[PDB]
Each structure stands twice: as structure tokens, then as C-alpha cells.
């Protein structure tokens, strides 16, 4: 199951946005991008399994990179804390 909250922007969200841009630059579809900012709202999904136990998270962010707005989804595994870029699409309209 997934449960949801909005988290505020600050260094943690800035670094999620920078992670997303670095990961997208590995793929190369949009050429080389450079991070500009994360804007509100930042969604945090917590993924539960079994007896309402956290398996991991997904952060869904609007990120300006190279002056274009993208939607990035980043997974984070609870056990390992490992993060991955799941989706990076755009450009997209501002929220």
C-alpha cells in the first residue's frame, strides 16, 4: 500500500533534485542538464507491506534543470537506503 504526505523544501529536497539530475545525465536522453531548483509541492509516498511495515519511499519532485521543468520520481529503499531514479519526464507545466 502507499500513504502520502507533502514535505517542505530544504537541503534534503535540494539534494534529491540534484540526485535526479545527475542520474538523468547518466542516461543522456535530454543531453547534459544542470540543476537549478526544486519547487513545491514535494510529495513523499511511503510504501508499506505486510503488517503496515515500511518497505521504502518514493519522492515525486518538480525540478528545474537547465531552465526547463521536469517531473522526477525517486525511490529510496528502507533497508539499504539506496536511491534510484524511476522517472524523469518533461518539460511539464508548473503546478
From Swiss-Prot:
Q: Site Blocking, abolishes the sweet taste: give positions.
A: 42
What this protein is reported to do is described as: Taste-modifying protein; intensely sweet-tasting protein.
The protein's name is: Monellin chain B
Binding partners and assembly: Heterodimer of an A chain and a B chain.
Record-annotated disulphide pairs: none
- Native organism: Dioscoreophyllum cumminsii (Serendipity berry)
InterPro entries tied to this protein? Cystatin_sf (IPR046350), Monellin (IPR015283), Monellin_B (IPR002095), Sweet-Taste_Mod_sf (IPR053768)
Question: Does this entry carry the keyword NADP?
Answer: no
The UniProt keyword set, sorted, is: Taste-modifying protein
SUPFAM superfamilies noted in UniProt: Cystatin/monellin
Can you tell which superkingdom this protein's organism belongs to?
Eukaryota
Practical use, per the record, is: Natural monellin has not been mass marketed to the food industry, primarily due to the challenge of large-scale purification of the protein which is relatively sensitive to heat or acid treatment.
Amino acid at each position: 500500500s502507499g500513504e502520502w504526505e507533502i514535505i517542505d523544501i530544504g537541503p534534503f529536497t535540494q539534494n534529491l533534485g540534484k540526485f535526479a539530475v545527475d542520474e538523468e545525465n547518466k542516461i543522456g536522453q535530454y543531453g547534459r542538464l544542470t540543476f537549478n531548483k526544486v519547487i513545491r509541492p514535494v510529495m513523499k509516498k511511503t510504501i508499506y507491506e505486510n503488517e503496515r511495515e515500511i518497505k521504502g519511499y518514493e519522492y515525486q519532485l518538480y525540478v528545474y534543470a537547465s531552465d526547463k521543468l521536469f517531473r522526477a520520481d525517486i525511490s529510496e529503499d528502507y533497508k539499504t537506503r539506496g536511491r534510484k531514479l524511476l522517472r524523469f519526464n518533461g518539460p511539464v507545466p508548473p503546478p
